[PDB]
Subunit: 198 residues, 4 copies
Amino acid sequence: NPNDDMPVDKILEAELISKAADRQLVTLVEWAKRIPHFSSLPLEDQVILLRAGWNELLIASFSHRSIDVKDSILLASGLHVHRHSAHQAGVGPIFDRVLTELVSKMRDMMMDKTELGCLRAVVLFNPDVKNPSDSAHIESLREKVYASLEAYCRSKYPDQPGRFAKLLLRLPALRSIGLKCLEHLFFFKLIGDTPIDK
Amino acid sequence: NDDMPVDKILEAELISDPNICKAADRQLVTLVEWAKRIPHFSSLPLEDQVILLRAGWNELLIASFSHRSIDVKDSILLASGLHVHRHSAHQAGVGPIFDRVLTELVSKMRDMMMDKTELGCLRAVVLFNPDVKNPSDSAHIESLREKVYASLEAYCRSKYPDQPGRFAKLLLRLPALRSIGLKCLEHLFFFKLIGDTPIDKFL
Amino acid sequence: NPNDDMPVDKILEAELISDAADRQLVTLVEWAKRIPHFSSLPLEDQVILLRAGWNELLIASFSHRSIDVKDSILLASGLHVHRHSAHQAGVGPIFDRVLTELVSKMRDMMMDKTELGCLRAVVLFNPDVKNPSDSAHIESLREKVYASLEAYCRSKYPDQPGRFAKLLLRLPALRSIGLKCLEHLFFFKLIGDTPID
Amino acid sequence: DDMPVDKILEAELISDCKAADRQLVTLVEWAKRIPHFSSLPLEDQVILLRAGWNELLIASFSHRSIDVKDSILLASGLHVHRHSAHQAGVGPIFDRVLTELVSKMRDMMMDKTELGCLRAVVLFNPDVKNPSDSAHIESLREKVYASLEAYCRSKYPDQPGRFAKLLLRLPALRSIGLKCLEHLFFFKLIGDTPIDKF
């Protein structure tokens, strides 16, 4: 029973996703459904888990996108955001945190997509979420993910004993950075001038 | 007095409110339309007529939707229809502030029967905020504020004569409005209301 | 009619009589007792009000002292902190707000001690502070304070009709500014960092 | 060198107003009693303290509860109440500390050696601002959770994914840590009882 409860090879498939700014890359919900047993979860909890974790799932995603590019974020499309551009925008320190704490640590560690999928899956399955309906159901799914993720680890990377407990130790940083992006100043610094007086 | 009439303010207040969360544009436009109708606001340097909009928009909408929620009981009726519900804003993690809004504004506005002319005067006082950082007029912006509450006192005196402390009661709702504004700003309360549903469940 | 319930003279007295760290015991709780019929309130409500208001109560007092010194907030212990100094301390913008919104405006209308006492008493009787015994009794004392303040403002300053309102319209700034002085970053910027070991 | 979990247990057992200096002291004592901490630059040895003191304290008093109803127990034996924390303006955080940490330390019955290892993981934070070579701080963390896994296997072999949590309790510890600084939670639960009468 390695990962029969939570495939892993199916989590990779979910991962393999191919002038008012906004471009809805909320394909994140297509991803959520493609994660095993998410649609089995109560519908009330499904929307609760996504509303709770959207900001971290997206931040971990583009962090792992810019593993190849230097000192830059690179959004899901081509928007190559630079450090100087961020520091001018007013989102400087938060930009550096994303780099040195997530993309840099992912890069040095050679985190693959099926590891990314599992960390994100663990984020999705948040048991701390408020008023779920079945926290034990959520609890169980999370377990089956990191169980399978530990099994995926120590097989593809058997010479690295504590690689499993290194992937998991990025989540505290993802939590911290996630909060910072939700701050209102962040959202208004990203805008700028406006001076939009008709 | 003659250069800050209560009817023009009441009319401005009456004309306003008879993802693709661009309902936020259908309220930002109303706010600028509303501001222009408040006497002497257009006759004001653009470098002020704009920076006290950026300073006040948050409290202005809270006073609006608070007064707009006197007829509901445990909700916030907003812009166009859409109840939001107590037992729902607590799901969004923004319940505590949702609470002290019903109680500190909606309740106090309900139990006082605050009318649309007073609401408009208070919102107009909030609009002409002389504590803005680097304005142009400064003293003019203040004198405008002064002419609003002068007219608003006179209005309360000539309608609620049996309530001598009526004028002060309205003014002492503003620090609570100030505090509630800071918190609503912090939590993006306004965007959680108009974004609440958008509860698109295509899953 | 006028202030037999909430005498301004007694509130004036309250202000008048209020004339290596290891420190601090500011008992404005003494002042609180002097405010007419404060001790008439329940003991629990007595604590609930002081814990809500202490930061605003004190910060108004420092603003009222610093009227005889430009671009500098004179301390209560006899100190003198300058604008440029607190900007280097990291807490400049907040110092400007205390300087231009409270201090500056208290001087331009020459707020007297009896009025300051009332504003602070209006702050003392916060009816928004939730879970007290009575949410209307503290509001009753609120009403009686500013009832007297208004009457006082008519007598001593008859040619200034909008004065009474001008007084009350400083409270929102006192609210906003007080809230900023309770941020942890604030309390850390004026100490610590390193200042080592 | 090494990272013996029994000595981490020692640190935790030897530990059990500005009088709360008798806890910053208790912290640096515990910290000093951790392997390789004292044997490290004073700069990095104090940067870690500046960074993690808040989380370190929360993980303690959250565990120090458990054997208690709706309250949090401290190093003075004084019970700060849920019925008081709400009246002190920090109710929502209190409930979060209880629900996300205390209740979960209870349900799984975390122990002192496990607690001290998580505290030690927080101590050796490699994401720190300016370390004198983060590699050491990082490696020490690696040696600590290497032992915490080993401990949890032998001590609790009927629950294999036990090591996965404890670690997955750190994201929650961060979000709460951030929220406690913001609210000045720590200072509000040592000053709650100190309330003078007249």
